[PDB]
Amino acid sequence: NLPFLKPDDIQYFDKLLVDVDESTLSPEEQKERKIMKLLLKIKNGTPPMRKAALRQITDKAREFGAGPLFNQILPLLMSPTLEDQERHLLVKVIDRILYKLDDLVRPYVHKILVVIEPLLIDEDYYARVEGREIISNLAKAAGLATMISTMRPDIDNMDEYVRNTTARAFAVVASALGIPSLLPFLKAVCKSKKSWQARHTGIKIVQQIAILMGCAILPHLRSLVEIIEHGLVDEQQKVRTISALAIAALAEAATPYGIESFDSVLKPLWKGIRQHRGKGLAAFLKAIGYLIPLMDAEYANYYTREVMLILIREFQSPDEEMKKIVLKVVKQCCGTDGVEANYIKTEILPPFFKHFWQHRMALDRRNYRQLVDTTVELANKVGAAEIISRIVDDLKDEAEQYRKMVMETIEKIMGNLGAADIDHKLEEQLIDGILYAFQEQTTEDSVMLNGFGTVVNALGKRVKPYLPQICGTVLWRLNNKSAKVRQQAADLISRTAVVMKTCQEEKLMGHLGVVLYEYLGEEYPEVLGSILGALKAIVNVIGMHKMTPPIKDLLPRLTPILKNRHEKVQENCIDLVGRIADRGAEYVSAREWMRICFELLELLKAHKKAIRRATVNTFGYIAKAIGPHDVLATLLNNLKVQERQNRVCTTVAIAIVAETCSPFTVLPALMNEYRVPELNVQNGVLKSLSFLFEYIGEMGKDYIYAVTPLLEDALMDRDLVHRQTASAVVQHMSLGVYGFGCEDSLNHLLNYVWPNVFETSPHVIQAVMGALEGLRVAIGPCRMLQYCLQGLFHPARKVRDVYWKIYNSIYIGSQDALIAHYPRIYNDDKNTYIRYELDYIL
Amino acid sequence: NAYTEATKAQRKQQMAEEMVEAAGELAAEMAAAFLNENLPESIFGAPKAGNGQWASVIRVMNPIQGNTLDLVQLEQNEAAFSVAVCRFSNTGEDWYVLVGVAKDLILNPRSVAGGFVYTYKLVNNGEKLEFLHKTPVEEVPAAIAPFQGRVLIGVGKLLRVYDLGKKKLLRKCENKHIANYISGIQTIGHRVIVSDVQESFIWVRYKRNENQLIIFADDTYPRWVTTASLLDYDTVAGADKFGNICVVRLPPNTNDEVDSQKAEVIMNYHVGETVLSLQKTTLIPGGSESLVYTTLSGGIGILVPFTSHEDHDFFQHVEMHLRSEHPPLCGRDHLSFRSYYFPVKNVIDGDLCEQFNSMEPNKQKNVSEELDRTPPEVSKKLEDIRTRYAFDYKDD
Amino acid sequence: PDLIFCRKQAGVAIGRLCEKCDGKCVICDSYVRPCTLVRICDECNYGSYQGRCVICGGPGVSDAYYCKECTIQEKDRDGCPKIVNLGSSKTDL
Amino acid sequence: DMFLYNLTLQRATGISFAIHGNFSGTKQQEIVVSRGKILELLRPDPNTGKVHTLLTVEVFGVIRSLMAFRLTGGTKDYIVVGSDSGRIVILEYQPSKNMFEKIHQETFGKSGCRRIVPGQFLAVDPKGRAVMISAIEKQKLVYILNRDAAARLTISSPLEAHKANTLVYHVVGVDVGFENPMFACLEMDYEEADNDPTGEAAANTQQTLTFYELDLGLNHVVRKYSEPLEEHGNFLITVPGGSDGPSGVLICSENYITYKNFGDQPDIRCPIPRRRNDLDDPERGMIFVCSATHKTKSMFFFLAQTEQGDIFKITLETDEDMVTEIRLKYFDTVPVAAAMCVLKTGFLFVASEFGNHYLYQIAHLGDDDEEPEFSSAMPLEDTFFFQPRPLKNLVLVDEL
Amino acid sequence: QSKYIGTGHADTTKWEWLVNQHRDSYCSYMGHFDLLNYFAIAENESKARVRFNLMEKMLQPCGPP
Ligand SMILES: CC[C@H](O)[C@@H](C)[C@H]1O[C@@H]1C[C@H](C)/C=C/C=C(\C)[C@H]1OC(=O)C[C@H](O)CC[C@@](C)(O)[C@@H](OC(C)=O)/C=C/[C@@H]1C
Ligand SMILES: [Zn+2]
Numbered sequence A: 001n002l003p004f005l006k007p008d009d010i011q012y013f014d015k016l017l018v019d020v021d022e023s024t025l026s027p028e029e030q031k032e033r034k035i036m037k038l039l040l041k042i043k044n045g046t047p048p049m050r051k052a053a054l055r056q057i058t059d060k061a062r063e064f065g066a067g068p069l070f071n072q073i074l075p076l077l078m079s080p081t082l083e084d085q086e087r088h089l090l091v092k093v094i095d096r097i098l099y100k101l102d103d104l105v106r107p108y109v110h111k112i113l114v115v116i117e118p119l120l121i122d123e124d125y126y127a128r129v130e131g132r133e134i135i136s137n138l139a140k141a142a143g144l145a146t147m148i149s150t151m152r153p154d155i156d157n158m159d160e161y162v163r164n165t166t167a168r169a170f171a172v173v174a175s176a177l178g179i180p181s182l183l184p185f186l187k188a189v190c191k192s193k194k195s196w197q198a199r200h201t202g203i204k205i206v207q208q209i210a211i212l213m214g215c216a217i218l219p220h221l222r223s224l225v226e227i228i229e230h231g232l233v234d235e236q237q238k239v240r241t242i243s244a245l246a247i248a249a250l251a252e253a254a255t256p257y258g259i260e261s262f263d264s265v266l267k268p269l270w271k272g273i274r275q276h277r278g279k280g281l282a283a284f285l286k287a288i289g290y291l292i293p294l295m296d297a298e299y300a301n302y303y304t305r306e307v308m309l310i311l312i313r314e315f316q317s318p319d320e321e322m323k324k325i326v327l328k329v330v331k332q333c334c335g336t337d338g339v340e341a342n343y344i345k346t347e348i349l350p351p352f353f354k355h356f357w358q359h360r361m362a363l364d365r366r367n368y369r370q371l372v373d374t375t376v377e378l379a380n381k382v383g384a385a386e387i388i389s390r391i392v393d394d395l396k397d398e399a400e401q402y403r404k405m406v407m408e409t410i411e412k413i414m415g416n417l418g419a420a421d422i423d424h425k426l427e428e429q430l431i432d433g434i435l436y437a438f439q440e441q442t443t444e445d446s447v448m449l450n451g452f453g454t455v456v457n458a459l460g461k462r463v464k465p466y467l468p469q470i471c472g473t474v475l476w477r478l479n480n481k482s483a484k485v486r487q488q489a490a491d492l493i494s495r496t497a498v499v500m501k502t503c504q505e506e507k508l509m510g511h512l513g514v515v516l517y518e519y520l521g522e523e524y525p526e527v528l529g530s531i532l533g534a535l536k537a538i539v540n541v542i543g544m545h546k547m548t549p550p551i552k553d554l555l556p557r558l559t560p561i562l563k564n565r566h567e568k569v570q571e572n573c574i575d576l577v578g579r580i581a582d583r584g585a586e587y588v589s590a591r592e593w594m595r596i597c598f599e600l601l602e603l604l605k606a607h608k609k610a611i612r613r614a615t616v617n618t619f620g621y622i623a624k625a626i627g628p629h630d631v632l633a634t635l636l637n638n639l640k641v642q643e644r645q646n647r648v649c650t651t652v653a654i655a656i657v658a659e660t661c662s663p664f665t666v667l668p669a670l671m672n673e674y675r676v677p678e679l680n681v682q683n684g685v686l687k688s689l690s691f692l693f694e695y696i697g698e699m700g701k702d703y704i705y706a707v708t709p710l711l712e713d714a715l716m717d718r719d720l721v722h723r724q725t726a727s728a729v730v731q732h733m734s735l736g737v738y739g740f741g742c743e744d745s746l747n748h749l750l751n752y753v754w755p756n757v758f759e760t761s762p763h764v765i766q767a768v769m770g771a772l773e774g775l776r777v778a779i780g781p782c783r784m785l786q787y788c789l790q791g792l793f794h795p796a797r798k799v800r801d802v803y804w805k806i807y808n809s810i811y812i813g814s815q816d817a818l819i820a821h822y823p824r825i826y827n828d829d830k831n832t833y834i835r836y837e838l839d840y841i842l
Numbered sequence B: 001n002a003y004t005e006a007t008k009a010q011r012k013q014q015m016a017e018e019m020v021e022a023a024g025e026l027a028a029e030m031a032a033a034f035l036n037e038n039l040p041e042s043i044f045g046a047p048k049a050g051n052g053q054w055a056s057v058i059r060v061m062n063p064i065q066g067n068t069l070d071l072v073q074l075e076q077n078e079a080a081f082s083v084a085v086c087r088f089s090n091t092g093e094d095w096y097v098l099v100g101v102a103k104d105l106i107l108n109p110r111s112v113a114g115g116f117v118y119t120y121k122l123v124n125n126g127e128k129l130e131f132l133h134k135t136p137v138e139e140v141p142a143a144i145a146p147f148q149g150r151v152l153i154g155v156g157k158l159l160r161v162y163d164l165g166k167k168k169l170l171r172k173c174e175n176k177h178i179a180n181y182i183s184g185i186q187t188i189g190h191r192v193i194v195s196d197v198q199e200s201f202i203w204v205r206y207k208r209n210e211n212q213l214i215i216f217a218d219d220t221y222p223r224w225v226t227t228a229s230l231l232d233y234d235t236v237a238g239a240d241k242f243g244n245i246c247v248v249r250l251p252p253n254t255n256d257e258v259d260s261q262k263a264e265v266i267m268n269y270h271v272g273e274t275v276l277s278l279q280k281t282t283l284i285p286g287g288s289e290s291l292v293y294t295t296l297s298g299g300i301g302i303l304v305p306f307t308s309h310e311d312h313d314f315f316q317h318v319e320m321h322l323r324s325e326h327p328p329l330c331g332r333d334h335l336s337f338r339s340y341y342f343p344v345k346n347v348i349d350g351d352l353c354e355q356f357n358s359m360e361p362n363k364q365k366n367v368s369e370e371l372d373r374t375p376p377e378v379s380k381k382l383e384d385i386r387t388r389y390a391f392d393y394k395d396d
Numbered sequence C: 001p002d003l004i005f006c007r008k009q010a011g012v013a014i015g016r017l018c019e020k021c022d023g024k025c026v027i028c029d030s031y032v033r034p035c036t037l038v039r040i041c042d043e044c045n046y047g048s049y050q051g052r053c054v055i056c057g058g059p060g061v062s063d064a065y066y067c068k069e070c071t072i073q074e075k076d077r078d079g080c081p082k083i084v085n086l087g088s089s090k091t092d093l
Numbered sequence D: 001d002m003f004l005y006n007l008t009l010q011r012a013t014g015i016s017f018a019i020h021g022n023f024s025g026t027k028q029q030e031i032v033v034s035r036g037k038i039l040e041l042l043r044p045d046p047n048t049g050k051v052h053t054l055l056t057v058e059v060f061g062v063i064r065s066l067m068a069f070r071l072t073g074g075t076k077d078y079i080v081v082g083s084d085s086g087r088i089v090i091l092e093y094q095p096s097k098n099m100f101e102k103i104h105q106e107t108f109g110k111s112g113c114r115r116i117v118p119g120q121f122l123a124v125d126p127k128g129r130a131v132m133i134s135a136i137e138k139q140k141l142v143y144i145l146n147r148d149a150a151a152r153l154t155i156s157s158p159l160e161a162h163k164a165n166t167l168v169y170h171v172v173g174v175d176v177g178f179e180n181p182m183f184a185c186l187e188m189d190y191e192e193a194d195n196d197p198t199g200e201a202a203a204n205t206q207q208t209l210t211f212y213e214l215d216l217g218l219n220h221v222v223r224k225y226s227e228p229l230e231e232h233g234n235f236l237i238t239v240p241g242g243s244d245g246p247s248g249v250l251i252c253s254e255n256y257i258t259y260k261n262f263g264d265q266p267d268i269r270c271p272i273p274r275r276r277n278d279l280d281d282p283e284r285g286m287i288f289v290c291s292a293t294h295k296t297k298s299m300f301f302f303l304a305q306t307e308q309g310d311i312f313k314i315t316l317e318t319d320e321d322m323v324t325e326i327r328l329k330y331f332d333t334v335p336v337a338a339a340m341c342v343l344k345t346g347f348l349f350v351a352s353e354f355g356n357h358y359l360y361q362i363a364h365l366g367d368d369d370e371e372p373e374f375s376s377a378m379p380l381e382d383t384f385f386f387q388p389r390p391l392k393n394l395v396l397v398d399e400l
Numbered sequence E: 001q002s003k004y005i006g007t008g009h010a011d012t013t014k015w016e017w018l019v020n021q022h023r024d025s026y027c028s029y030m031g032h033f034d035l036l037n038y039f040a041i042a043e044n045e046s047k048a049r050v051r052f053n054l055m056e057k058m059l060q061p062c063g064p065p
């Protein structure tokens, strides 16, 4: 039957809505209906229909011919309403039909490319990947000379578009058939005397071969370079520019190997540096920039000193592409190991910071990124202070964006190298420009925050003399009432608390502590979350007695915030409660801790994982401080009331208490709940036991004999679910105690799990199988094979199915281990069934 | 696949006789160079032939020097697999050398024509072997052990109590309920431990009144045993063809009168290299007893008992930490590797633990601080094991 | 309905998880001890499916992990664990 | 209670694998050996002629295959290890830290020395562009190796090359001159043998030398070529191709060696020479146990050792792009080795399959003397014969 | 499970089971080094020849059905 049709699919699958007998009306070449269904089964349909129709159209690919195939496929690939996945399917079927039709696709090659080549420039990266893919498969199906003869006339076309896409297509077929297969075509076209557009197109083929192939060029690098190197002295400026750009592309793809292949290109380039201007000089300089890192140390010194004059001259070019090119080249030169830092400090830095660090460069985002990253890469070689000093004074500029640029630059520099390079003067200059640049903020630039915290943490104990001033500015900023600056200041406190502890200014963190405490009534949730984060950051480093908001007063103020709906407030608040729980331990009523505990219990079901982790951890801390006895009784009471709908969180709580405090404390009670006659609570304690053992894992090695009888009577048939979840308990115990010497107890429970091997309900039988696999890893495949050998050749078939199934579970896992456990089976008349090698004795 | 020196000599001579047959008269010269030169078999390899051929030699060698005291070249197709030196209760203090031999052993497919047991006089205080008698037997005897003035010999799956006679070794008792084949046998003063080739160890008692070998225990698991040693009157430590080591122990309250006792396994551990010798011994004077084993790959290892549960928990936590912070190099799971055929039971991998010194300093700090210690303390506590049981030459 | 694992050869693509299924194991839905990183096949991690959740197919926010119980049983060593529906086509949500 | 504690005092001394190369990234050549459970890095000194153990590491697994490779333009050799894990690992030795850095580790199967899980066999493309790990039966995987801009090695997703009901005697990468990577392997299909109660399908079922090709442009692996062999072979030898020598493989077989490059190259065979007046039973065959390969910018040759420890120097005469004859020559005799390594500066490492290991110095290449040199074109029907002599081409320099 | 070689079912003959475990056993001999060492010591043959015989045994380890 036909699947669902979309409105845009009527244009391509209209002739299937009418039922006609195919044989009655079967004109030769009107069997398209056939392929139609297959195609309509691939685009719209389930995976089985797609694979079935796929294999059907690949087997009959020769019979159908390329004509109908592509004549019906290309319109679908051309439909504007085509989804990306549908297009992927059309690509795969295009490949799988191209593989069968080896030579038949030649007369249609052109008709394919005019439909496909646009995809090589589509905005969608995946569409470009698919276009390259099917062009490659087309280059393998048809011959090399077929693609060459098909795409050659478009080489010297007058339109730049078709030359560009043609060059990219030739790069694709170069990747499909290998560089050597297309080497002679490029050697011929790149020296064509017919027109310059041909040589330009071929050189573009070299460039796109560089970009596309990448590091796979290195073997053929000298071949391509020797094919292309002549274009640097041609009378046409366009072919010189594209030749230098393709040299730069080859150098980029060959990084960091392959300096020898560019040998015959080093001197021309250099020469051109003295006699070229405009964007051709930009291409030459770009090639030099991508070529210098490939060189050795001494030759990098020689060449860099040989081009640095013209480079410095072009530091002040009016063109923007020139400025960005020479900036990238500066980064590339000053990244090379051969360029000593003294030379850069003498001849490079003064014009660099004179001409490039202007106010007009901080406005363009591209100039921003290029200048900042280039400057940090300079700092990585010439030193931290040597760069920071030249831009510290600009931290006090009136233009805020310039302060953003220099602040980010110094932030990354000090984040990379550190503060050991900084003297006293540059230190005080840093704190000055950072304070001033942080005080007059029009918005809430995170760059100023990262810069402040980064420089403070970098100075470490060197910031102690400035902490009163810093905390004053942080307080004034904290009371600005622009809610986001209160948030930002709280974040800064949270980032610098650890350094404030190591500077002997605990009382200052006290003032910050009470000031932050007097802000928990905040309405804006994000700001409140930052406040709680700063409080948690101070509590962790300060002693519990030196907390200016005493915990006796602090915690009950945090208890109502746990009802906040925002996820950030919940996470930070819970985390603070847990820090007080683990470290503060006391100072709150056991009933108060309890109240907190049962406020937190629902938050185990939180949607965000971080909140779940925090809730688990703090619940563990408060369970350690309180003790298991009182809380466990209320959890056991909560297992019965509000059952099935909200008991899972109480189960997690029982496992948590069983972990932080030894399960010696809570397991006996859990036993007591099992006795009562009501059956659903039996399932409650069974489930809770499964999650308990799965959670504690290895701690259950000393608590198996205690739960053995419960799993004996429970595991022996009372209720179907009883045996289900009880087998689950056996599985979790087996996996948790695996490798801790409990083969006797688990081996004993095996004798009770095994009677339940024959069962029909899927859930309980899959639980039993899982228990058998856990007992396989914890007991060993030997015992499992022993239990499994009896019914492998049992006369009954219904037993052979189950025992063979178990044997499959034990064979897939630890197949190499079964070699030592296969029993001896004596050979009969027709066969030899004895492994004689294992009977050898030395 | 070997010739004895005599057989090699006859085939070389015969090959010279065939060699002269060619019409040619340089055949006698080629036979001069050929017969004169017996190439060194150590470097140019030993001539090998025959799927059923063998070569066995008994040697009496002094361990102080390298001299061989006596040499006994056996027959062509005789292959010795067991040997022992002991006294007999019926004779005086004369030392006798029993050697278990096999006749026409063909492996793959396994088929044996016969077996022999040579008896030697070992006179001149262990410097020469004098032929006494050669007692034939049906199956290959690969196990000979001194037992209460007599000799236990394991011929095939039949464990027999043998006494010395002036003409042949008289069969005094026999037990044929052994599963497959006897690879080795060791006896404490009263009991008998036999190593089945495939069915682990078996525990047999010898009733002196009737000369009856009653099987009173066996193992719950099959084990391709290679060697073993009795750690005490109840436990046995055994090796594995698949490179495993185990310790199996009888129930504490047991007597040899009861039957069908299931011996519980108290130790499992995959070494990773096939072990062929276990020995409980002290390595240095003043140290403690260790279970030294050798391996088929030319390696020497030791198993060492813990003195307290605190150390057990300590090294165990070390194992757990290094299993995650220092995982095996080739992607293998350490716990699964040591649980190759049987799950690990009460063994800590000290080779993994000593890699604590190879980790990064931050990982040493984390693992050490998790144990409330410092990295140098962990390293010293690791060296303590070698100081107590192995070789430590530090002199303060 | 009828959901099944991919079970093709996993590659270098790291499986992802959305905010709802941030801590589940792809195979047994267990939240305890996320252990080994999840690898998925190239076809299941392609185009519109890149970075999508392995369980429900939503926008992934973290990485997917097999639970420790699966790692012990070598359930990570099977095929790609991305849940696919044998009824929904590739355009369907 | 009885808790134990295992410790090793003398690590395993026998060698299961041995490869050589510039693992330190310098002009010095080192030897990585696998003792089974332990990976070890040794450095033979060209001065004193002693082998020193640079590094020794417990891998806590079963090492089943060991290979070294190098990317194009590289100066340092990596280490691919096929283990009993369901994972393949590429390692890099670090001299500054004296440790193997696990560069890559990709998972594909289950643990243990399994039958259909790859790890037993490992063959790498001689240009370093791809590696192939394969099992004894059915499953075969190929990873593509390519470095990034930071010159760090990167691995690809696995490409399947499975073939059901097929057994693999050996896998070997074929040296093609930067063409599509070629992995030649010996296969044997038992589907017919498993469905014939007469046993006649078991006989006459000969192994097939098959060439697998990695289509780098199409990113898939196809069973490109396959031809049955005359008699069963035990292992293959990579013949250097591209600019240095003709591409192809040397199939070692019981009593024969066969150069069988595919295309228009005719099969060239030569019988295994036997020692004069073998005291062995003539009914027993003779194979090679291992093979070393030395490649020079000028020439190349091979060293193939027999079961008796007979090392032969195998040279190939070539015309145009085809091979003419296989020239064997009796080199020397050493104990039966599990692996051999021919290093520059004239040294041969012989890791005996059992007993002590040896390190010799190459005094003469084996020629310029008056010993007989056998060729494949020599007619006979009867094998060649030679005289085993004491060591005259090698000198024992160290013994481990 | 059907696609995993060595897996069995109810209609699996004894010959199929023991040829499966025979091939598994031979592959394990190929893998574990010390096992192949023990075997190569028992029968005085080099490791290469023992592995060769173990590979020849893979065609029909037991016999025709
Ligand atoms: C009955 C069993 C079911 O799985 C049941 C719990 C599910 O129906 C509920 C549904 C709710 C939404 C699921 C809740 C899940 C949790 C509270 C888990 O936390 C996380 O994942 C968070 C983080 O990734 C790890 C935190 C940990 C290190 O503290 C972690 O510690 C350990 C030792 O594993 C805790 C894990 C617990 C269970
Ligand atoms: Zn999800």
Ligand SMILES: [Zn+2]
Residues within 6 Å of the ligand: C006, C007, C008, C040, C041, C042, C043, C044, C080, C081, C082
């Ligand atoms: Zn997938």
Ligand SMILES: [Zn+2]
Residues within 6 Å of the ligand: C025, C026, C027, C028, C029, C030, C066, C067, C068, C069, C070
């Ligand atoms: Zn799981």
